[PDB]
Design a protein around this ligand. Structure first.
Ligand SMILES: COc1ccc(CNc2ccc(CN3CCN(C)CC3)cc2)cc1
Ligand SMILES: COc1ccc(CNc2ccc(CN3CCN(C)CC3)cc2)cc1
Ligand SMILES: COc1ccc(CNc2ccc(CN3CCN(C)CC3)cc2)cc1
Ligand SMILES: CCCCCCCCCCCCCC(=O)O
Ligand SMILES: CCCCCCCCCCCCCC(=O)O
Ligand SMILES: CCCCCCCCCCCCCC(=O)O
Lengths: 251, 238, 59, 283, 283, 60, 59, 283, 238, 59
C-alpha cells in the first residue's frame, strides 16, 4: 500500500498510516552548498544529526469558528534544541526543512485544510502607513491567528483572512508548494522545502525564509459526539543545515 | 562617405523595438549566476496550475470565505440543479480573478481546452452521484437535467477518490477566441445536477460542501499582449 | 562574425535574417526573444512518487 | 564559416490531439485526488471520443522574455529653466520600480528577477503662461546624471558636482531622437528581490520590507545653461525595458489597489463581484 | 554560397500570335454556347488570317500584390493642445477600413483577404487664429497608443492609462520623418472578411453585417506634455499598405455611392448613361 | 563611426515605396493558412470573364 | 545571408540587386512584388466535362 | 582569413581559496618584519581553516585604461554675440588640466602619463534679459580654432587670423550633435609630467613647478558671423577623455583642497576626523 | 544611396562611450616610447600596498602625529582593551583617508579579504603578548576579552620578529558590499586586548607605542566607478 | 580587415563582436579597454633577496 509513509531524521521517526503522497518543494531536494557557489571563505560547521531532527511545534485547537493560523520560519525554531544554539552563535545559516502537519478525526467529521509554504511572505500593517514591531507576526513557536473581519488595531498586521495578509486572493495560494488535509481521505500532510533565497547564505534572525499557513476552506462540522475540538500539531525537521561566522552569542 | 538616405520611421521611439545600444558601465563585472529553485520560463506554466474558483457569488455573502463552497443537502427533489455558470474564463466574475483569469487578462486572444476539478468535502460516510455537463453555445441554456444530458457530460461517483475531472473540449468555429468575449465568440455553459441524491447515516451533518478548481490543458495558448484593466491609479504613489 | 538564423513565420507561408554585434559588452546585445523551451512539471507534478494517470491515485 | 555562422532554433507547437474510440475498462483517468498537491494531467482524449487534430499553435508570446520585454514608464517629473526656488530647477529621483502601478504589478508576479536593462528618456518643454510671452530662445540642452550610492549630490543647478569625471552622463538636444542606453545586472546579490520579509537590524528592528534592499542610486536632470527671460517648464519621462530576463518562484497577482510606494499596505477587498444567485447564467 | 544565395524568378509574357492561313472545314471555333457557363477561348487566329507576332508585354502590374500595394488614407482627425472640453484634446478611433471610399472600394472587390500591414502616420500642426498670437513654443511631441480589444481606455489627456507597460506605442517629434511600423495578420479567423451575411445572435437577431466581425481595437493620440498659452491644432492621417497579399472569391465592383460606414445601404442607380439612339456613334 | 552622407529624398514618404520596418507585435503567432476555393492572383483573370453589355441606351 | 536576384528590365535593354533582412519577424520584410504566375481556368472554364474549342459545344 | 581575423583575449579572475586544515609546525607565516619594506603576502588560508572557494570576480574595472577613460569637464566660459567690449565677444584659453578639481585629482595620482586624447565640445546659447526681446534670428554657427604655441593670436572677433590656412578648426551649427575629434600624444618629452620639481633658469631662478612645462597652445572660439540686434550669450564646455593610457610612479592622493591653478600651494589639514575615544565603536 | 533609419540615442553625448573619431593632426609623428621604471597597470596594485592607519583619534589630539601611535603601559588590569574599531574601510574615519580607503572611495562596491599588520615599537628588552580578534557582524560588539576570543583571533608574541599579521577573512552573505556601508551590509568589528601584559626591566621607558598597517589581499576587487566626495570647489581655480 | 573578438560576459550566461578601422591614424581607434594583465611585485616585493613567506624574515 502507498498510504503508509515513514520518515527517519536523526534520532526521531515519524509514522503515518493514512496519508497522501509527499510534495518536494519545486522538484528539488535539499543539498549542501557547492564549492563553486560559496562566497564565505572559512570552514563551515555541519552538526548533522544534532540539528537535523524532528521538533514538535506546540499544538492548537480546531474549532467550528476557526479561521486560520500562520508560523514564520526559522524564527519558530529560534529556541529549540541545538538548532537554536547554532542560530544564536553563528552569523550565517542555510538549511532546508521537512514540514509534517498532523490532524486526525473520525469518519463522521468533515472539513478541509490548506497547508502551504509561502517564501518571502511580506505582510502589510493594519493601518496604511504607520509601522509595527517584530512581535505582531513572530514571537517564537506560538501561532498567530487570522481574522474574519478587517483588522483595526494599528499595532498588528492586517489579518483579514480572504486577503491572506498579502493583498492577494486567498484562493490563488495553490501556486506555492502545498497540500490539502481532507478528513475523508487523509490525516497528514508532508512538504519538503529546499533552501530558497537570492544569496547563498543569510542571517537566520534578521530574515524570515518562508511562512507556513493553515487555512480551513471548509469549516469543521460534526453532530452528537463528545469530541468538541480537533487538535492540530506541526512538526518540522531541518535538513542539510550548515553555519558560518562564529561570534559571541545572541543575535 | 557612404551615400545613404533615411526612410520613414527614423528617430521614432517604438516601445516594442529590438535594437542595440551603448553600455553606460563599460566592462562591468556581473555577479556569478546561481540556480535558485523554481525557475519559470513561460507564463503558461503558471496558467496550468489549479486554483480555487469562487462559484458561490450569491450577492448576500456576509462572509467572503463562503464564496468558495457550494452547498449540498440530504433531501432534494429528484432532479435539481447544484450550480450553473458561463464559460468566459477572462470575463466572467467566477473566473475573472482566478490564477487562470489573471493570466488571460494580460492577453487578447486565447484557445485550447480547460480542466474543471471538483472535490467533495463531506463526511466519509456520505455518498452520492452528480451529473456535470458542458453545453456548447446555443440560443438557450439548459433548464433541466434532461436538457443538460444531451451535451458533453460525466457521471461522478463519490467514493474513496474524492475528486473528478470534467475536461471541457475546444469546440469552436475559429482558431482563437476573444478574452473580452462577445456574442460572436460565445463559449457555452456549465451546469451540475443531482444524479441520485446525497444519502447520510445517523450521526452525521445534514449538509456538505464542494469546491471547484480551474486550470488549462497542455494545448492552451494565448496571444496579443495588452494591459490589464484590473489595476489603476489616480495619483503618483509616494 | 555574422549570425544567420530563421525569422518567425508570417502571412504567405527568404525567412532568414542577419545579425552583427557592434559593442564590446554583452549587455548591449538585442533581446533574445526566440527561445521557446518550457517544462511545467516543477509546478504541476511536485510529488515524490510518480503518479500514473490511468491508475487510481490513493492506492 | 568565419564570415557567416548559421544558428538553429526550432518551433515547438502545442501537443496534438489523438484519435480516441469507445472504451470500457477498469482504468479511471478522470478520477484523481487533489489532496496530493498534484494537478491532473487528463486530456479530452481520456474522457470522450476525439478526432485527430494537428495543432500549429505555439506559445511564443507567453515567454517571460516577451512578457516583460516592453518599455514601461517608471517616473515623470517637471523642472523649470528659471525660478526663485532653487530646488524647483532640477530633479533628484532615488531609483526604484514601485512608483508606477502597471509595471510594478507586472514585476511582482515573480519573487526574484535577473536581467539587463535598457533605459530611454523622453523630454518635452512648454512655455509657461503669462502676461508677456514674446521672446526668442535657441534650442535647449539637457543633462542626465547618474550618481551611484555614496557619491556627491548637487545642491543647486550650477553646482560643481555637475562636472562629472567618473559619473556617467548624457547631453541631449531638443528635436533629436530620445536618449537611450544599456545597463548590466548591477545587484550585489545573485538576483533582484521584489519582496524581502525581514528587518535591517540584527535584533529585528528598524526598516522592514523591500525598502531595505533599495540602494541603486539617484538620477539628476537639469538644463545645461538655458535660462530664458520668461519661465519654461520641461518634463522628463523614464522608461525601463528588461532584457535577457530570468525569473524564479512565481506568486499570485495582487488583488488590492496599491497605496504606498515603499510598503505592501492595503485595504481589504472582496474576492470578486456578485451575481443574483448560484444558478443565474443570463446577462 | 552562405554569403550569397542566388534567387531565380522569370518573365512570363502574354501569348504570341501564330500565323494562320485560309481554311475551309467542318470545325466551327466561332460557334459556341454560353448556356454552359463557359467563356469562349477563341483567338483572332481562329477567325481571320494573321501574321506571326512575338509579344513581350507582361501582366506584372495587374497582380493583386501590386494592385493593393499602395498606401491609402483611412482616417484623419484633429485634436487641440489646450481647450476647455476634455474630449476634444485627444482622438479615439475604432479601427476599420470602411471610412474612406477609395480604399474601401478597392478592398471590396474581393470577399476574403489575408495580408500583413504597414501603417504610416502623418502629423501636422497649425496655430489657431486669435487676437494675440505672439508666443514662443518649443517643438511638440506626440504619442500614438494602440489598445487591443478589452484593454483600458484613457478618459482624459493626462490619464494613467497612457503609461503603457504592454500596449505598443510610438513617440514622435515634429520635423522628422513620418512614423511607420509593420503589423502581422491579426485575425482570429483564417482570413479577413469584407462581407458577412449573418447575425450576431444564434436566433437570427441583433447586429447584422460586417459590423459583427470588427474587433480590431482602438488607436489613441495626444500631445505628450505640450500645452501652449494659445491653442494649437494638430491633424493626424493614417495610411494602410497591405503586404504579402492573398485574395479569394472576386465580386463585381460597387456601382452605387456609399452612404454608411458600417452598412451596405444604398440608393438605386441607373445601370449607365444614355445616348440618342441605338445607332448613334458620333460624339 | 562609419562616415556617411545623406542624399536627396531622405525623410520623404513615397506612397509606393518598398522598405523594411520594425514589427509592433514581436513574435506574434499567425493563424494557420487554409486553402479557400477560388483564389485570384491577377486582375486579368477577372477581366477575362464575360459580362452582359447594356447596348440599348436609347435615352427613353 | 544575402539574396541576389534580377531586377525588372528598363530603358536601354548589371540587372542584379542585393537584399538582406534585418528584423526577426517575417512581417517586417518588403513586399514580394515579383511573382507573376496566374491561371484563369478557375473562372473561365468551371465546367465538368472538357470542351474542345474546335468541336461544337452542345453535341 | 584576410576578411576576418580572430583576436583572442582572456579572463583573468582573482585567486581562488584553497582548503586548509589544522596545523602545528615551526613555520610562522603570520610573523614578519615590515622594516624590510616588504608587504606581507599571507592569505587567510595561512592562519585559519578555510574551505575551497572558486572565485570568478575579475579586476576588469580597476585598470588605468578604464579608470581614466571617462569624459570630464576641463573648462567653461561665456562669450556674447554683440557687445561694446571687444574682449568679451570671444574666448582665449591656454590649454591645461589644472582648472577643474575632480579630473585634476584623478590625473595627479600618477607622476607621468602617456595617452591619446578625445576632445568633445558642448555649446549652448541663451537670450540675455532686457526690456525688449522680440526678434527673429536664424540658427547660429560657431568656430573653434586651435593655435599651437608661437602662432598668431586674434585680437578681435573679425580679425584676419580667423582665416586659418594651417591651424585646425571646426565649424559647428546649433541643433546638431556635439563636435568631437582625436588628438595624438603631442609632448616633446617621452611622457606628460604632472609634477616638475625644478626651475626654468639654469641658476635655479625664475618660474618654479609644473608651470614651466605647459606649452600646449591656445583655443579660441567665436560666433562666425552672428550679430543679433539684441545680445545673446553662449557657453562652451570642453571635455577630455584619455585613450590608450600608460602611467608610471603612482603617488598618494591629495588631502588638502586646491587653491591655485598653477601651484601646489595649500593650507594644512587634519589627517582625519575624530571620535570620542580609542574604544568608541558605536555610531 | 543605402536606405537607413536612425534609432533612439542618435546625436547623444554619453561620457563613457567608445567610438572612432577623426584625427585633427593627420600623420603626426609621436615621440618614441621609453620604459620608465615603475609602470602601474591596475589600481589594485596600489591598493595592495601597506599604509599607516591613524587609529588614535581621541578628539583631543593637539599634535596630529599622535594619531598614528597606540599607547601601551607596563601596569594594567589583567584584561584590558587596547583599541577597538569598526571594519568599514571606505566609510570609517580610521580607514577613510588611508591608501586603501582613498582607492575604495572612487568605487561603489568592494569584496575580498584584508590584512592588518601590527608592529611593536618599544624597547628591545620589553616583552608582552596581545590578543587581536575579528568579530563578524552582530547585534552587540564584544565588551570583554572573553567575548572577543569567541571570534577569529590570533595570539601575538613579541620577540625578534616585530610584526604580526591579522588576516580578516571575507565572511559575507552577498558577493559584494557597498562602500557607503549601511546596516544591511555591516562587516563587523576589530578589537585588541592584553593577553599577558607588558613587562620591562629597570632602566627602560614605562610606555610604548604600536602602529597599524592596512592593505588588501590578492582576492580583493572593486566595481562601479563613481566620483569621490572628498574633493570639491566653489569657484573656478585661477 | 575585420577583427572578431569576444565581448564581456553579461546576464544570462553569440558573445562575439566585429570591429573595423576607418581612419588612417592609430590615434583615431577606440579605447583598448580589454587588457587585464597586472603584476604588483614592483610595489609589494621591491626587496633584493627573495623572502619566503613560511620562513622567518630576519634570520
Ligand atoms: C544609471 O542608469 C540606470 C540606473 C539605474 C537603473 C534602474 N535599475 C534597476 C531598477 C530596478 C531593479 C529591480 N530591483 C528590484 C528590487 N528593488 C529592491 C530594487 C530594484 C533593478 C535595476 C536604470 C538605469
Ligand atoms: C496597432 O497597429 C495597427 C492596428 C490595427 C490596424 C488595422 N488592421 C486591419 C484593419 C483592417 C483589416 C481588414 N478587416 C476586414 C474585415 N473587417 C471586419 C475588419 C477589417 C485587417 C487589419 C493597423 C495597425
Ligand atoms: C587642439 O586640440 C587639442 C589641443 C590640446 C589639448 C590638450 N592636450 C593635453 C592636455 C594636457 C595634457 C597633460 N599635460 C600634463 C603636464 N602639464 C604640464 C601639461 C598637460 C596633455 C595633453 C586637447 C585637444
Ligand atoms: C564596429 C563594427 C562595424 C561593422 C560594420 C558592418 C560590417 C562591415 C563588414 C561586412 C560584414 C563582415 C563582418 C565579418 O567579417 O565578420
Ligand atoms: C542586423 C544585421 C546588420 C547587417 C549589416 C549589413 C551587413 C553587414 C555584413 C556584410 C554582408 C554579409 C552578410 C552575411 O554574411 O550574410
Ligand atoms: C573607409 C572604409 C569603409 C568601409 C565600409 C564598411 C565595410 C564594407 C566592406 C565589408 C567588410 C569587408 C572589409 C574587408 O574586406 O576587410
Amino acid at each position: 500500500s502507498d498510504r503508509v509513509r515513514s520518515i527517519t531524521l536523526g534520532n526521531s521517526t515519524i509514522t503515518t498510516q493514512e496519508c497522501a503522497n509527499v510534495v518536494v518543494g519545486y522538484g528539488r531536494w535539499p543539498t549542501y552548498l557547492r564549492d563553486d557557489e560559496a562566497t564565505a571563505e572559512d570552514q563551515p560547521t555541519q552538526p548533522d544529526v544534532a540539528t537535523c531532527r524532528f521538533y514538535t511545534l506546540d499544538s492548537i485547537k480546531w474549532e467550528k469558528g476557526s479561521v486560520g493560523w500562520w508560523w514564520k520560519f526559522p524564527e519558530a525554531l529560534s529556541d529549540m534544541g541545538l538548532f537554536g544554539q547554532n542560530m544564536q552563535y553563528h552569523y550565517l545559516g542555510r538549511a532546508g526543512y521537512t514540514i509534517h502537519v498532523q490532524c486526525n478525526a473520525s469518519k463522521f467529521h468533515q472539513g478541509c485544510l490548506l497547508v502551504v509554504c509561502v517564501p518571502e511572505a511580506e505582510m502589510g500593517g493594519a493601518v496604511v502607513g504607520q509601522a509595527f514591531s517584530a512581535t505582531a507576526m513572530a514571537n517564537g513557536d506560538k501561532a498567530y491567528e487570522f481574522t474574519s473581519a478587517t483588522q483595526s488595531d494599528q499595532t498588528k498586521v492586517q489579518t483579514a483572512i480572504h486577503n491572506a495578509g498579502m493583498g492577494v486572493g486567498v484562493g490563488n495560494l495553490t501556486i506555492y508548494p502545498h497540500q490539502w488535509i481532507n478528513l475523508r481521505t487523509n490525516n497528514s500532510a508532508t512538504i519538503v522545502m529546499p533552501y530558497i533565497n537570492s544569496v547563498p547564505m543569510d542571517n537566520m534572525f534578521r530574515h524570515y525564509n518562508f511562512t507556513l499557513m493553515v487555512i480551513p476552506f471548509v469549516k469543521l462540522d460534526y453532530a452528537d459526539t463528545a469530541s468538541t475540538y480537533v487538535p492540530i500539531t506541526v512538526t518540522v525537521a531541518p535538513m542539510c543545515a550548515e553555519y558560518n561566522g562564529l561570534r559571541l552569542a545572541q543575535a | 562617405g557612404l551615400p545613404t538616405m533615411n526612410t520613414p520611421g527614423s528617430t521614432q521611439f517604438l516601445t516594442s523595438d529590438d535594437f542595440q545600444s551603448p553600455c553606460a558601465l563599460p566592462q562591468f563585472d556581473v555577479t556569478p549566476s546561481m540556480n535558485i529553485p523554481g525557475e519559470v520560463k513561460n507564463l503558461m506554466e503558471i496558467a496550468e496550475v489549479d486554483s480555487v474558483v469562487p462559484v458561490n457569488n450569491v450577492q448576500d455573502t456576509t462572509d467572503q470565505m463562503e464564496m468558495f463552497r457550494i452547498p449540498v443537502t440530504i433531501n432534494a427533489p429528484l432532479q435539481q440543479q447544484v450550480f450553473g455558470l458561463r464559460l468566459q474564463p477572462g470575463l466572467d466574475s467566477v473566473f475573472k480573478h482566478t490564477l487562470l483569469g489573471e493570466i488571460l487578462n494580460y492577453y487578447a486572444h486565447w484557445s485550447g481546452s480547460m480542466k474543471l476539478t471538483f472535490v467533495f468535502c463531506g463526511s466519509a460516510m456520505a455518498t452520492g452521484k452528480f451529473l456535470i455537463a458542458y453545453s456548447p453555445p446555443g440560443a438557450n441554456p439548459p433548464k433541466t437535467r434532461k436538457d443538460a444530458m444531451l451535451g458533453t457530460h460525466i457521471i461522478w461517483d463519490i467514493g474513496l477518490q474524492s475528486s473528478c475531472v470534467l475536461c471541457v473540449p475546444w469546440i469552436s468555429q475559429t482558431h482563437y477566441r476573444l478574452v473580452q468575449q462577445d456574442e460572436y465568440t460565445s463559449a457555452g455553459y456549465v451546469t451540475c445536477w443531482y444524479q441520485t441524491g446525497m444519502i447520510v447515516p445517523p450521526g452525521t451533518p445534514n449538509s456538505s460542501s464542494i469546491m471547484c478548481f480551474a486550470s488549462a490543458c497542455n494545448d492552451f495558448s494565448v496571444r496579443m499582449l495588452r494591459d490589464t484593466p484590473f489595476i489603476s491609479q489616480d495619483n503618483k504613489l509616494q | 562574425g555574422a549570425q544567420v538564423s530563421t525569422q518567425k513565420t508570417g502571412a504567405h507561408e527568404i525567412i532568414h535574417y542577419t545579425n552583427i554585434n557592434y559593442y564590446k559588452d554583452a549587455a548591449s546585445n538585442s533581446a533574445n526573444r526566440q527561445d521557446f523551451t518550457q517544462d511545467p512539471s516543477k509546478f504541476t507534478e511536485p510529488v515524490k512518487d510518480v503518479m500514473i494517470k490511468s491508475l487510481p491515485a490513493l492506492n | 564559416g568565419d564570415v557567416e555562422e548559421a544558428i538553429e532554433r526550432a518551433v515547438v507547437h502545442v501537443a496534438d490531439t489523438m484519435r480516441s474510440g469507445p472504451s470500457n475498462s477498469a482504468s479511471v483517468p478522470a478520477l484523481t485526488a487533489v489532496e496530493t498537491g498534484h494537478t491532473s494531467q487528463v486530456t479530452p482524449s481520456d474522457t470522450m471520443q476525439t478526432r485527430h487534430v494537428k495543432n500549429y499553435h505555439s506559445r511564443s508570446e507567453s515567454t517571460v522574455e516577451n512578457f516583460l520585454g516592453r518599455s514601461a514608464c517608471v517616473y515623470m517629473e517637471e523642472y523649470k529653466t528659471t525660478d526663485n526656488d532653487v530646488n524647483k530647477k532640477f530633479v533628484a529621483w532615488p531609483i526604484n520600480t514601485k512608483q508606477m502601478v502597471q509595471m510594478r504589478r507586472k514585476l511582482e508576479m515573480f519573487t526574484y528577477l535577473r536581467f539587463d536593462m535598457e533605459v530611454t528618456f523622453v523630454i518635452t518643454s512648454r512655455q509657461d503662461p503669462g502676461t508677456t510671452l514674446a521672446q526668442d530662445m535657441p534650442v535647449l540642452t539637457h543633462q542626465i546624471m547618474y550618481v551611484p550610492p555614496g557619491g556627491p549630490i548637487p545642491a543647486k543647478v550650477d553646482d560643481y558636482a555637475w562636472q562629472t569625471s567618473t559619473n556617467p552622463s548624457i547631453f541631449w538636444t531638443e528635436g533629436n531622437a530620445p536618449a537611450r542606453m544599456s545597463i548590466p545586472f548591477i545587484s550585489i546579490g545573485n538576483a533582484y528581490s521584489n519582496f524581502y520579509d525581514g528587518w535591517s537590524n540584527f535584533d529585528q528592528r528598524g526598516s522592514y520590507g523591500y525598502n531595505t534592499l533599495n540602494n541603486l542610486g539617484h538620477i539628476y536632470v537639469r538644463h545645461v545653461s538655458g535660462s530664458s527671460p520668461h519661465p519654461i517648464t520641461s518634463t522628463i519621462r523614464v522608461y525601463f525595458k528588461p532584457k535577457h530576463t530570468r525569473a524564479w518562484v512565481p506568486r499570485p497577482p495582487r488583488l488590492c489597489q496599491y497605496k504606498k510606494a515603499f510598503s505592501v499596505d492595503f485595504t481589504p477587498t472582496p474576492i470578486t463581484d456578485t451575481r443574483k444567485d448560484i444558478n443565474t447564467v443570463t446577462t
